[PDB]
């Protein structure tokens, strides 16, 4: 559906998980597999302010 | 009237965001006033009627 | 028991000490050891500025705005030694010989060529026949109306080294006006107060105020000869021309007799250029010249960013 | 020969602080460390009748 | 007279010297009222002490 509906951008402490997710990422993001996904380009991929 | 003098505090009352509030600020984007107080009221004692 | 106050100076000192840029690297050539030490510092700085490997080697964290200087050489008759620094000047093109003189022109010189302010201009220039010799086809170029194509704006002058016949002149072309001799002391730009029309007040919800206000320049062939006018406006390049034509309409009505039905080369009423941009919400300042016969009131404007434009036809 | 000149300086400050004024009895003064970050704040009174 | 002495005063640029004090001790002198002799006696009548 729409990109940003419930996506929170806030900087949480994320867990580093071992399994690999990168496979088929951009294609499944473009066709629309999962709803409420957010893409951020290199200028906007940082820890947000508080 | 021969007083020409009062007495007041010399430094401001400090308030700082501790960790217990910092987690809520980071995740939920809200900070409570002196979380220690609400925790001593809610979780520690069952009644503690005011 | 002092209060200690409400704000702390340690924070201010620290953050400002962080804000100061590192010093320029002097290189000491006269003494050997100082030279060697500065060269060592230079190689360390290049190692510190170009290696993606480390992070402290990343220095880009936290503008170059002098003007572009252009030097012109002119005869000592076609320029008063006393004329103030920063007056916008306009240039002319010679056909074969250009190295002899450039023949750069001043607004009072244009007022003289075109025929109070008259008396001031004569007290600057009593015998301005050299002025007629600089443009041989003045009487031809008023009619051919090609006069604006050759008068190219040069803008404010900074310095003029004074010689017997030739004059050395430094002119701001693009960028903010600034000097050179010192840590770049600033200048301002002067235009006579008469023969200048404020087109933001000529027609005077609430009209909006932009950040930047521009100065235009226009050249009009009336039956009383040609004349030049500079306009302090702010609205837009698409509206200043319309408002200017509305302004000139009473002077345009007179040109029915002079125009030629057969030859269409004379019809243009004038052209408009944009010289530069200055701060709005301020206004300008009033001063008189300090010369021997000085009676002209003059507007002078701060914060001039010289961005010259071309002549655009209006009619 | 180069001439070095001296020209004297004066300051017209006066020591002034907020708590030493009496107005400071009107308010109650707390120092918040990071106030620019706080977006909004509110107080919620509950009054029984 | 108090209005008169308030109209002046202020700050001085030099700000260096020590000022005359009363010999008994205490406050340093603020200013000088130069008058004639008759106004002097009448001011001593209106102002004793």
């Amino acid at each position: 559906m729409a990109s940003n509906e419930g996506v929170e951008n806030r900087p949480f402490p994320y867990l580093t998980v071992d399994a690999d997710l990168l496979s088929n990422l951009r294609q499944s993001a473009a066709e629309g597999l999962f709803h409420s996904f957010d893409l951020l380009v290199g200028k906007d991929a940082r820890e947000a302010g508080i | 009237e021969a007083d020409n003098q009062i007495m007041g505090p010399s430094s401001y009352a400090s308030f700082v965001v501790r960790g217990e509030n910092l987690v809520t600020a980071v995740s939920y984007g809200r900070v409570m006033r002196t979380f220690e107080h609400f925790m001593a009221r809610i979780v520690d004692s069952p009644e503690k009627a005011g | 028991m002092k209060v200690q106050g409400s704000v702390d100076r340690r924070r201010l000192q620290r953050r400002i000490a962080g804000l100061l840029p590192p010093p320029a690297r002097r290189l000491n050539i006269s003494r050997g050891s100082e030279f060697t030490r500065d060269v060592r510092g230079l190689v360390e700085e290049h190692a510190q500025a170009s290696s993606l490997s480390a992070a402290a080697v990343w220095r880009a964290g936290l503008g170059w705005r002098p003007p572009v200087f252009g030097d012109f050489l002119i005869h000592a008759s076609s320029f008063n030694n006393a004329e103030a620094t920063g007056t916008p000047l306009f240039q002319f093109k010679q056909s074969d010989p250009f190295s002899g003189v450039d023949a750069v022109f001043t607004p009072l010189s244009l007022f003289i060529l075109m025929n109070g302010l008259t008396r001031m201009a004569n007290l600057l220039y009593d015998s301005p026949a050299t002025l007629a010799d600089l443009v041989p086809d003045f009487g031809r170029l008023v009619a051919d109306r090609r006069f604006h194509n050759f008068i190219t704006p040069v803008g404010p002058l900074v310095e003029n080294i004074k010689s017997t016949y030739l004059n050395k002149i430094t002119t701001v072309v693009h960028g903010p006006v600034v000097s050179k001799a010192i840590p770049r002391s600033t200048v301002k730009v002067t235009v006579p107060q008469e023969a200048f029309v404020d087109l933001d007040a000529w027609l005077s919800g609430l009209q909006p105020c932009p950040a930047d206000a521009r100065l235009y320049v226009a050249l009009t062939y009336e039956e009383a000869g040609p004349r030049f006018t500079f306009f302090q406006s702010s609205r837009g390049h698409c509206q200043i021309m319309n408002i200017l034509r509305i302004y000139y309409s009473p002077s345009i009505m007179h040109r029915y007799a002079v125009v030629q039905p057969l030859h269409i080369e004379e019809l243009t009423f004038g052209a408009v250029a944009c010289l530069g941009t200055f701060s709005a919400t301020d206004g300008w300042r009033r001063s008189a010249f300090n010369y021997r016969g000085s009676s002209l009131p003059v507007v002078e404007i701060d914060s001039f960013y010289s961005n010259v434009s071309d002549w655009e036809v209006i009619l | 020969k180069f001439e070095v000149l001296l020209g004297v300086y004066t300051n017209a400050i006066q020591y002034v602080r907020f708590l030493e004024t009496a107005l400071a009895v009107s308010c109650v003064n707390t120092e918040f460390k990071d106030l620019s970050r706080m977006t909004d704040g509110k107080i919620q009174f509950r009054i029984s009748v | 007279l108090s209005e008169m002495v308030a109209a002046v005063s202020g700050e001085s640029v030099l700000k260096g010297v020590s000022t005359y004090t009363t010999a008994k001790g205490g406050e340093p002198v603020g200013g000088v009222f130069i008058v004639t002799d008759n106004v002097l006696r009448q001011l001593l009548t209106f102002l004793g002490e």
Side-chain angles (χ1 to χ4, degrees):
Chain A
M1 297 293 298
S3 57
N4 317 338
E5 307 173 332
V7 185
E8 291 201 0
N9 48 20
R10 297 158 197 177
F12 308 90
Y14 285 135
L15 285 71
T16 309
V17 218
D18 204 1
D20 39 18
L21 319 161
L22 280 67
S23 186
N24 269 335
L25 202 135
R26 276 174 70 256
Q27 304 318 292
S28 298
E31 159 83 344
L33 168 58
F34 35 86
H35 315 272
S36 61
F37 76 108
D38 190 7
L39 185 153
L40 313 177
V41 89
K43 66 182 57 196
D44 289 324
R46 81 177 178 282
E47 305 77 359
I50 321 192
Chain B
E1 173 172 1
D3 201 0
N4 61 76
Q5 275 291 116
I6 67 185
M7 283 192 184
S10 58
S11 59
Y12 305 140
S14 93
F15 177 74
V16 69
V17 266
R18 309 288 292 167
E20 296 268 350
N21 297 110
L22 204 150
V23 166
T24 75
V26 163
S27 304
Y28 298 91
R30 300 162 63 103
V31 181
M32 202 135 70
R33 171 67 161 185
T34 324
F35 182 95
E36 190 277 338
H37 294 174
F38 273 177
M39 207 195 48
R41 299 189 181 280
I42 279 196
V43 81
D44 284 302
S45 283
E47 300 273 21
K48 195 167 180 172
Chain C
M1 312 292 165
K2 286 314 180 183
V3 52
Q4 101 165 348
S6 53
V7 310
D8 191 1
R9 66 193 65 86
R10 286 301 182 268
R11 179 64 183 265
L12 212 77
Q13 289 175 356
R14 290 314 172 267
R15 180 51 175 257
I16 291 190
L19 278 190
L20 284 191
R25 277 81 56 76
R26 299 276 185 258
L27 167 61
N28 300 82
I29 76 173
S30 78
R31 185 93 175 84
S33 58
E34 303 180 342
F35 178 78
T36 56
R37 194 52 61 87
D38 187 66
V39 149
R40 303 287 182 95
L42 169 61
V43 301
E44 275 186 27
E45 179 77 1
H46 173 66
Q48 193 204 356
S50 55
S51 292
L52 178 151
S53 311
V57 174
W58 173 79
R59 55 171 287 188
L62 179 48
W64 181 81
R65 287 189 55 172
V68 288
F69 289 133
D71 286 1
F72 292 151
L73 65 152
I74 201 192
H75 195 267
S77 59
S78 46
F79 192 65
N80 290 119
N81 291 102
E83 186 164 12
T85 289
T87 274
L89 263 70
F90 306 134
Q91 206 184 38
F92 170 73
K93 161 239 301 309
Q94 302 301 323
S95 66
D96 193 5
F98 60 99
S99 63
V101 179
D102 299 330
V104 199
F105 289 129
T106 70
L108 272 71
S109 303
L110 279 180
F111 170 62
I112 281 292
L113 271 177
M114 296 187 168
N115 278 312
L117 291 73
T118 312
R119 189 48 174 185
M120 161 89 100
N122 295 319
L123 290 150
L124 277 190
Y125 292 145
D126 281 320
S127 186
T130 274
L131 284 64
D133 184 76
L134 284 179
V135 176
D137 292 344
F138 183 89
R140 174 63 179 182
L141 286 185
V142 287
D144 285 338
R145 69 151 270 258
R146 301 290 181 264
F147 189 55
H148 59 265
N149 296 328
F150 305 151
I151 304 310
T152 63
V154 172
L157 317 184
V158 188
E159 316 155 349
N160 166 43
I161 279 79
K162 289 167 274 288
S163 307
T164 312
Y165 302 168
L166 323 181
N167 287 123
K168 184 55 168 188
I169 287 187
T170 304
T171 83
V172 166
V173 176
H174 190 251
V177 301
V178 213
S179 316
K180 176 173 84 293
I182 223 58
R184 293 182 180 100
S185 276
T186 73
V187 294
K188 59 203 63 56
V189 41
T190 62
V191 158
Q193 181 167 3
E194 213 281 345
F196 160 83
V197 187
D198 184 13
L199 192 37
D200 301 340
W202 175 80
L203 27 105
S204 64
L206 194 55
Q207 205 271 128
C209 173
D212 211 327
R214 301 196 287 272
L215 182 60
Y216 301 86
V217 48
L219 186 139
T220 291
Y221 309 88
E222 304 169 349
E223 300 82 13
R227 48 183 292 198
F228 56 95
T229 40
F230 323 124
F231 298 80
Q232 164 201 346
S233 40
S234 62
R235 299 187 170 172
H237 181 87
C238 306
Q239 305 165 29
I240 179 63
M241 332 288 280
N242 305 329
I243 306 160
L244 182 57
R245 185 186 310 97
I246 303 162
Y247 174 87
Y248 269 112
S249 177
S251 179
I252 306 169
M253 293 300 299
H254 209 65
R255 277 196 51 193
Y256 179 75
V258 176
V259 293
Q260 205 62 223
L262 167 59
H263 274 304
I264 48 198
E265 86 169 347
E266 200 177 3
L267 271 60
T268 282
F269 194 80
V272 187
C274 183
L275 297 169
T277 63
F278 66 96
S279 76
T281 73
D282 303 325
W284 46 265
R285 303 189 45 243
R286 328 182 137 187
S287 189
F289 251 154
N290 315 282
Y291 305 130
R292 165 160 301 251
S294 65
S295 313
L296 157 73
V298 162
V299 309
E300 51 163 13
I301 38 173
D302 313 326
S303 285
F304 199 61
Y305 189 73
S306 81
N307 187 36
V308 293
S309 152
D310 297 334
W311 304 101
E312 198 181 351
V313 191
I314 57 168
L315 179 49
Chain D
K1 55 154 182 179
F2 269 146
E3 212 175 9
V4 170
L5 314 186
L6 316 178
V8 185
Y9 75 121
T10 52
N11 312 326
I13 62 161
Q14 183 44 235
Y15 180 82
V16 159
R17 295 277 174 78
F18 176 77
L19 291 195
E20 293 180 9
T21 44
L23 171 146
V25 79
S26 79
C27 67
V28 177
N29 301 272
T30 58
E31 191 196 29
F32 195 108
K33 301 294 296 175
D34 333 303
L35 189 153
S36 41
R37 307 305 185 74
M38 154 216 168
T39 278
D40 185 3
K42 55 181 192 300
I43 309 93
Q44 211 194 350
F45 301 96
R46 172 180 177 188
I47 323 178
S48 32
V49 178
Chain E
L1 264 34
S2 165
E3 172 170 351
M4 172 168 320
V5 71
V8 218
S9 82
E11 280 166 0
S12 134
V13 208
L14 288 180
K15 199 188 311 183
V17 81
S18 185
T19 76
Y20 297 84
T21 83
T22 62
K24 271 188 181 184
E27 294 85 10
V29 201
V32 164
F33 285 98
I34 306 175
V35 302
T36 71
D37 310 343
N38 299 138
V39 171
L40 202 262
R41 183 172 73 253
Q42 297 185 4
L43 286 181
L44 300 195
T45 59
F46 282 63
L47 295 188
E49 292 186 346

